[PDB]
Design a protein around this ligand. Structure first.
Ligand SMILES: Cc1cc2nc3c(=O)[nH]c(=O)nc-3n(C[C@H](O)[C@H](O)[C@H](O)COP(=O)(O)OP(=O)(O)OC[C@H]3O[C@@H](n4cnc5c(N)ncnc54)[C@H](O)[C@@H]3O)c2cc1C
Lengths: 579, 83, 167, 167
C-alpha cells in the first residue's frame, strides 16, 4: 500500500522523502527505509568528550558557497541549508592572522621524501622541492601544476561544458577514453606525477574527463560547514519529513529504521508492482547486523533507491538483469576513505604557526587537518581542548593502517576539563570501528615526525572510521574511463524505462564526492519523473545536471571557440604565474 | 609559627636574582607580621608576593581559559616571527 | 615596582642602562651588531634572524630562525600556550607529559621538547639554571633590545647606603 | 629439493637461469652493471656500495651503504639476531617490542625499526608484501648475484605436462 518507497536514509533519500511529502503527502503514501539506526549515511557527525562545540566530521564536512549568479558552487546545498535555517560557519583552510595580511595556508607543512618545507616554498623556494621536476614543471604547487597540464592538453578545458569536454580529442583519442594516470603519463614527467600525488583530489584510473579539470589554487577559496556538523542536514530533513502535518501515513510511521532492503521482486499486481523484501537489523555500538527471522514484505508503486553502488549490488532484483543497468552499474569506482581523530588538551600546533587547513606527508598518515579549539568556538567552553584529523584514501597506504586494528582498544585518559563530568571509561567513544592503542601510538609517532617534534602531548581521546565495509563500500565514487558518463548521469536516474524504480545519490552524479551530487540527482529525478516543481529556494539559473553530448559523438561537428582571446590570455597569464 | 624570627631577602622570594625580590619579601613581612601600613610611595596595584596555589593541588579543578583567542593569536604570531 | 618607587622616594638619581646602541639616532642599531663567538664561528646578533645559516648549531628545522631567547619563548608556548601570562598558582597546576611542571628541572623538561643542539645553543648563545625548577626557568619573554633598564648614577649600592643613612 | 630431484627423476633438461653477466670470464660483472632509475636518478647496482651518494633516498646514517636486500638483512638482525636461521617453530615464538612477530604485518614492523625513506628505498629498489605476516616476509639472505637458479630448457610448464604425460 505504498505509493513511494524510498530506500536509504542518506542525504538524497531524506531530501527525496521531504520533497515528496511536502508536495504530494496529502494523497500519497511515502515511507523511508534505512539499513541502520542512524540517519545520515556518509554524513556522520560526532562530538568527542571535551569537545562539545568542535564537531568531528567522520563523513562529509564542507561545501562551496553558491556564486553570486547562482550558476556555480554547490548551489543546492547552500540554498537548501538556507531554506532549513541550519546555521553555517566558515570552514577555514589556513590562517586568518595576521589580520592585516593573512598567512593563509602558506605556512602549512610538507614532509616528503625526508624533506621539510612549507606550502609557500613551491613558489618562493622551488629548490626545496625534492622532486626532480622538468624545467618547465618547476615553480608550481601541485594544484597549479595540474592546471598547467590541463591547459597543455586543451586550453580552457575546465571552462567547457561536459558535452564539449566529452568531444575533446587528445593524441588522437577522446579524453574520456583515457584514465587520468595514462593521460598524464603522456604530458608530465614521472617525477611530476609523483609530485602531484604526494604533495596533492585525484584517482589514477578514473576518467581523465572528470579528473583533469583543475582550478588555480587559492587559500582564499571559501568553504562552509554546518555548526552542528554536516549530518544536521539529513537529520533535519528526516525530522521535517516526519513532521509534515496531514497525509495518509502518520508522521511517526513514515521512517522505518533498521530495515535492510534485501530484495526487490516484480509482482503481478499492476497498481503496486514492486514487492520489497526487508530484513530487520539491529545496531550495536555503530555495528549493524541482521536480526534472524522473517522478511517484512511491502508493496509499492514506485521505488527510489537513494543508494551508492555497493549498496545497489547487495540488493537482489531482476531489475539489475537489465543489460544497460548490468553494464553501467560498474561504471564508477569506489574510493575507500579513512579518518582518524585525535583529541588533545591544548592545540600544540598553534605554537608551530599552524591554525587550520592541512599538512601533508608521504608517511602513512598522509594528511593532518587542524580542526579547532573548544574555547575559540562561539559559545565554547573555556577549555583549550583541540581536535586533529588525519585522513587517507590511497590504496597503497591502506594496508598499513589496516594491520593496526587488532589489539587492545585505546582507552585515552580523562582530561582535567572533564574531571567529575564524564567517566574515565567513556572518554573514548564506542564506535563501529574501535580505535586500538597501537593505531593511536603509531598515528602519534607520525604526527610527531611530521611536525618535526621530539614529543607532543598525548591524545586523551580518539576515533577511527573506515568507509570501506558494507553497505557503503567506500567513501565516494569516480567515473571510470571508457564510459559515457554524461549519458549514464541522465539514464541512471531511471535506469529501466519500463520499471518505476529510480536511482539517486552521489554515486552516479556529476558532483561525485559531494553532497551537491546527491542533492542534484535527487532533485532532477523529482522534477522529471515525479512532476514536482522547482522549489522557491532553488534558483532557476542553476543547472542540476550537465546536458549530455549526442549519443553519436564519433566524427562530431567542430567546437566553435567562444571568445578564444580571453581563454588564450588566461592560459598565457597562468603560465607567467609559474615563470 | 611559635617563634618571632622572620627571614627576608632575595633567597626565598619570587623575584630571585633581583633587588626587587629582597624588597618584596621584606615589605610583605613588615605589612603582615609587624603591622606597618603600605607606604604612600608604594602603589596598591602592585602585588608584593604571588598568591599560592592550594596546599592540595593533586587532582586540582580545571583552569578556565581567560580570553584564549588572544593567547592563541599571540602564540601563532610569535611562531610566524621565526618563519 | 618596589625598586623603582623606592628609588623615587629616596631621591636617588637614576640613569638609562643601555643594552645596545642608540646610534644612528634615526634607526638605532641596538644590540644587532653585538658579537657572538661560538664554536669557532663569528656572527652578530642580527644573524639569528637575518642569516641563520651562520649559526653553527645543527638545530632542528623547526628551531631555526630564532635567537636563543625567542627559542625559549617558542619552547614555553609548545609546552603550554600563554604559560608566562598565568599566575604562579595556575603555573603550579600545569601538567606536562603527565607530571606537574614544578616537579621537573629545567634541563630535564627541555630535553623532552628541544633537540640537544637546541639546548646547547640556548646555553651557549644565552638567564637559566639546568637543575632549577622548570616553573621559574621556563617563563620567557620575546627578546627586545628596546627593553628598558635603569641603573643608579651613583651605583646600585647607593640604595642600601642611603637606607642605612636614613635609618 | 623436491623440484630439483623431481626434475632429475623425470629426465627434464635444466639450464642455468642467469641473474647477471658471466663476462668478463675472468672477473664476471654479474649484476653490478644492471640499471636503476628511481626518483629521476640513474645509477647501477654496484653504486649501492661503491657510490652511496648516488642513491636518491634520504636514508638514516646507519642505513646507508647497503643495497635493498642487504638492508633487509640488517633490519632482521636488528629485530632478532640470526632470525632467518631459526626453525619456523622458534620464529613463531619470537617477540619484538612486546608482541609476537607473527602478529605484525611486514610494513608495521618495519615502521618501528626503519626510517620511512628506508622503507621507500627497499620497496622501490627491491620480494615483499606490506600486509603479509612479518614472520614470512622478514627472513632475508645476504645478496649475491652468484646465487644459482635453474630453469627448464623447455620451460617450467614441461614439469606439469610431463607429469600429466606420465600419469
Ligand atoms: C570521508 C568522506 C568525506 C566527505 N567529505 C565531503 C565533503 O567535505 N563535502 C561533501 O560535499 N561531501 C563529502 N562527502 C560525500 C557525501 O557525504 C556523500 O556524497 C553523500 O552524503 C552521499 O549521499 P547519498 O544519499 O548518495 O548516500 P549515502 O550517504 O551513502 O546514503 C545511503 C544510505 O542508504 C543506507 N542503505 C544502504 N543499503 C541499504 C539497504 N539495502 N536498505 C536500506 N538502506 C540502505 C545506508 O546505510 C545509508 O544510510 C564525503 C564522504 C566521505 C566518505
Amino acid at each position: 500500500p505504498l505509493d513511494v518507497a524510498i530506500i536509504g536514509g542518506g542525504v538524497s533519500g531524506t531530501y527525496s522523502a521531504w520533497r515528496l511529502q511536502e508536495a504530494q503527502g496529502d494523497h500519497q503514501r511515502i515511507q523511508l527505509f534505512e539499513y541502520s539506526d542512524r540517519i545520515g549515511g556518509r554524513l556522520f557527525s560526532i562530538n568527542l568528550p571535551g569537545l562539545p562545540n568542535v564537531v568531528a566530521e567522520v563523513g562529509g564536512m564542507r561545501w562551496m558557497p553558491a556564486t553570486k549568479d547562482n550558476t556555480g558552487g554547490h548551489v543546492m546545498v547552500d540554498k537548501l541549508v538556507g531554506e532549513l535555517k541550519l546555521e553555517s560557519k566558515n570552514f577555514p583552510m589556513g590562517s586568518n592572522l595576521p589580520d592585516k595580511d593573512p598567512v593563509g595556508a602558506k605556512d602549512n607543512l610538507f614532509y616528503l621524501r625526508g624533506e621539510r618545507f612549507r606550502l609557500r616554498d613551491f613558489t618562493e623556494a622551488p629548490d626545496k622541492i625534492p622532486y626532480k621536476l622538468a624545467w618547465s614543471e618547476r615553480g608550481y604547487g601541485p594544484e597549479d601544476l595540474q592546471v598547467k597540464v590541463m591547459h597543455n592538453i586543451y586550453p580552457g578545458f575546465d571552462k567547457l561544458s561536459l558535452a564539449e569536454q566529452m568531444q575533446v580529442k587528445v593524441f588522437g583519442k577522446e579524453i574520456w577514453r583515457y584514465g587520468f594516470w595514462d593521460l598524464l603519463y603522456r604530458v608530465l614527467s614521472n617525477e611530476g606525477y609523483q609530485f602531484m600525488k604526494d604533495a596533492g583530489a585525484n584517482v589514477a584510473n578514473a576518467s581523465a574527463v572528470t579528473q583533469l579539470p583543475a582550478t588555480e589554487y587559492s587559500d582564499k577559496t571559501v568553504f562552509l560547514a554546518l555548526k552542528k556538523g554536516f549530518q544536521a542536514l539529513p537529520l533535519t530533513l528526516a525530522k521535517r519529513f516526519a513532521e509534515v502535518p496531514g497525509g495518509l501515513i502518520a508522521g511517526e510511521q513514515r521512517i522505518r529504521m533498521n530495515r535492510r532492503l534485501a530484495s526487490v521482486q516484480f509482482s503481478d499486481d499492476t497498481e503496486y508492482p514492486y514487492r520489497l523484501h526487508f530484513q530487520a537489523t539491529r545496531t550495536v555500538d555503530g555495528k549493524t547486523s541482521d536480526v534472524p527471522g522473517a522478511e517484512e514484505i511491502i508493496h509499492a508503486r514506485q521505488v527510489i533507491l537513494a543508494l551508492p553502488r555497493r549498496s545497489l549490488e547487495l540488493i537482489q532484483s531482476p531489475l539489475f538483469d537489465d543489460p544497460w543497468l548490468k553494464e553501467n552499474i560498474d561504471s564508477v569506482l569506489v574510493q575507500s576513505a579513512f579518518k582518524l581523530f585525535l583529541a588533545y588538551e591544548q592545540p600544540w600546533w598553534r605554537s608551530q604557526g599552524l591554525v587550520a587547513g592541512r599538512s601533508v606527508t608521504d608517511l602513512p598518515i598522509r594528511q593532518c587537518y587542524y580542526m579547532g579549539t573548544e574555547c575559540e568556538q562561539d559559545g565554547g567552553e573555556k577549555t583549550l581542548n583541540s581536535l586533529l584529523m588525519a585522513s587517507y584514501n590511497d590504496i597503497g597506504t591502506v594496508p598499513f593502517w589496516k594491520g593496526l586494528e587488532d589489539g587492545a582498544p585505546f582507552e585515552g585518559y580523562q582530561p582535567k576539563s572533564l574531571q567529575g563530568r564524564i567517566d574515565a571509561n567513556e572518554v573514548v567513544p564506542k564506535m563501529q570501528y574501535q580505535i586500538s592503542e597501537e593505531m593511536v601510538r603509531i598515528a602519534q609517532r607520525q604526527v610527531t615526525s611530521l611536525h618535526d617534534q621530539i614529543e607532543l602531548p598525548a591524545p586523551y581521546s580518539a576515533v577511527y572510521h573506515a568507509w570501506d565495509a558494507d553497505p557503503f563500500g567506500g567513501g565516494w565514487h569516480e567515473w571510470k574511463a571508457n564510459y559515457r558518463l554524461d549519458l549514464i548521469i541522465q539514464r541512471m536516474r531511471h535506469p529501466v524505462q519500463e520499471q518505476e524504480v529510480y536511482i539517486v545519490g552521489e554515486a552516479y552524479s556529476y558532483g561525485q564526492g559531494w553532497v551537491e551530487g546527491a542533492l542534484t540527482t535527487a532533485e532532477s529525478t523529482l522534477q522529471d519523473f515525479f512532476g514536482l516543481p522547482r522549489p522557491a529556494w532553488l534558483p532557476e539559473a542553476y543547472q542540476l545536471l550537465p546536458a549530455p553530448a549526442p549519443v553519436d559523438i564519433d566524427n562530431p561537428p567542430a567546437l566553435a571557440c567562444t571568445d578564444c582571446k580571453k581563454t588564450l590570455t588566461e592560459v598565457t597569464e597562468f603560465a607567467y604565474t609559474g615563470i
